[PDB]
Structures are given as C-alpha cells and as structure tokens.
Amino acid sequence: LEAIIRKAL
Amino acid sequence: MQLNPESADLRALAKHLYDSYIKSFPLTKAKARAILTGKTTDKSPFVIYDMNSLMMGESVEAVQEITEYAKSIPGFVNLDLNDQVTLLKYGVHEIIYTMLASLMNKDGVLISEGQGFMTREFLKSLRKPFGDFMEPKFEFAVKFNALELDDSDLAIFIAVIILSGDRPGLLNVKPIEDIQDNLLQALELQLKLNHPESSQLFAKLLQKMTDLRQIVTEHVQLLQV
C-alpha cells in the first residue's frame, strides 16, 4: 500500500 | 575456500539475519514443515477440502512483518528513506510468495498461522477466475520446495530480494547494490556449507527470482479483474 510501509520505518 | 576473517563475518551476517528472521515472522518453515509432516506440534489444523468442510470452518499482516525484518538488515535503515519504501514496495510481493512456499506441499497450503489447511484442488475448483488465483503459486512452490531450503537459507535469500538495485524510482542505486553484494556473498557461502549435494544451488536460487517477478506480474494481471 506504500502507506503501510511508510509507517513502520 | 578457507575459514578466514572474511568468511567469519559472512557467517556472522548469516546468523544475524536468521535471528531477525525468527523475531519478525511467527510461522517459519521449520515449524510449517513439522505441522505438514508427522512430527506435528499442538492442535492439528482443520483441513478444508470441499464446500462442506469450508462451512464447518466458516497480506496486510505480512507487509508489516517484512518491513520489520528489512529494518534489521545492516545498512538498510541508513539508506534514503524514499528508497527504503521503494525497495519494500516492489519486493514485498516477491517475499510473500517466497514465504508462502514454506506453508505449501503438493496437497494444499497452511492458513490461519497453521490453524487451517486448504487443499490445492479445492482452490482450483472455485469459480473463474478465483480458481486461477492460487494455482500459479502452487506450481512455483513445487519447484521451489524441490530445492529444500531451510530458514537459514531463506533468511539471506529474503534479504537479497529486498536490496534489489533495479526497482523503478530508486534515488541512490549504488549503496543499495553494495549491500546486496554483501548479502549475495553470505548467501553463496551459506548454500555451499548447508547443501553439499546441490550443484550450483546458488545459481538456481537467483533464477527463481525471475520466476517470482513473473508471478507478481501474473498476479497483478489477475487482480485487474
């Protein structure tokens, strides 16, 4: 989703 | 080859990636194969093989686990934050289908963290085009599991896929490839020490990455429906 990835980082 | 400081650092890199492989993912292959084979652990999974068994049993989670494992790869957190998202954007689907082969045998796939087991033929009996959703993944898994990798092999193999310097939209490609070159060295040594019987298993694993991108390409085409 790219939004899920741009969060755990 | 010889046991020298460069070799020991590659093994220490393999051990570090393996420990993060265990911390990040709950259901590993070693526990998956134990459930699928005889040496099963706790409660036996509920097998779903037809419509009646589906009734009496009535991806987003994996994306978060893979990102946690990528943060443990040495040098991944030091890259540009935009490239970190780009690597995980085009690689998470290649990882998920690699992890999926660990939960698969020739009969079906392990689901619900090992609580269920849906057969391959029941998935293919579903209505079109849902009957073609999991079939490409099973054909890949039969060929992939024929390599007989364990969690120590997959931990480094998963790391090499993440550090792919050919992803579209990478701002800094050189530092990404320097990490993959270090990961490829550790993966080559890991396969030579762990597989004395497979000739050129390192070359065969790299060719499986081309097969993974064909699955993701075929999967996206199936998702436009």
Author numbering:
A (entry chain B): 141 to 149
B (entry chain A): 202 to 259, 289 to 455
Sentences from the study reporting this entry:
Peroxisome proliferator-activated receptors (PPARs), composed of the α/δ/γ subtypes, are ligand-activated nuclear receptors/transcription factors that sense endogenous fatty acids or therapeutic drugs to regulate lipid/glucose metabolism and oxidative stress. PPAR forms a multiprotein complex with a retinoid X receptor and corepressor complex in an unliganded/inactive state, and ligand binding induces the replacement of the corepressor complex with the coactivator complex to initiate the transcription of various genes, including the metabolic and antioxidant ones. All four coactivator peptides contain the consensus LXXLL motifs that interact with the activation function-2 (AF-2) helix 12 upon ligand activation, whereas the two corepressor peptides contain the consensus LXXXIXXXL motifs; we investigated their positions in the cocrystals. The same applied to the interaction of PPARγ-LBD and the SRC1 coactivator or the NCoR2 corepressor. These structural findings support the idea that the agonist-induced formation of the AF-2 helix 12 induces the dissociation of the corepressors and the association of the coactivators.
PPARγ-LBD recombinant proteins were selected for the setup as they were mainly prepared as apo (unliganded) forms. We also revealed the structures of the unliganded PPARα/γ-LBD–NCoR2 corepressor and PPARα-LBD–CBP/TRAP220/PGC1α (/SRC1;) coactivator cocrystals utilizing X-ray diffraction. The enhanced degree of structural flexibility of the amino-terminus of helix 3 and the carboxy-terminus of helix 11 to helix 12 of both unliganded PPARα/γ-LBDs was supported by two independent solution-phase amide hydrogen/deuterium exchange (HDX) analyses that revealed stabilization of the PPARγ-LBD AAs 279–287 (helix 3) and AAs 470–477 (helix 12) by rosiglitazone.
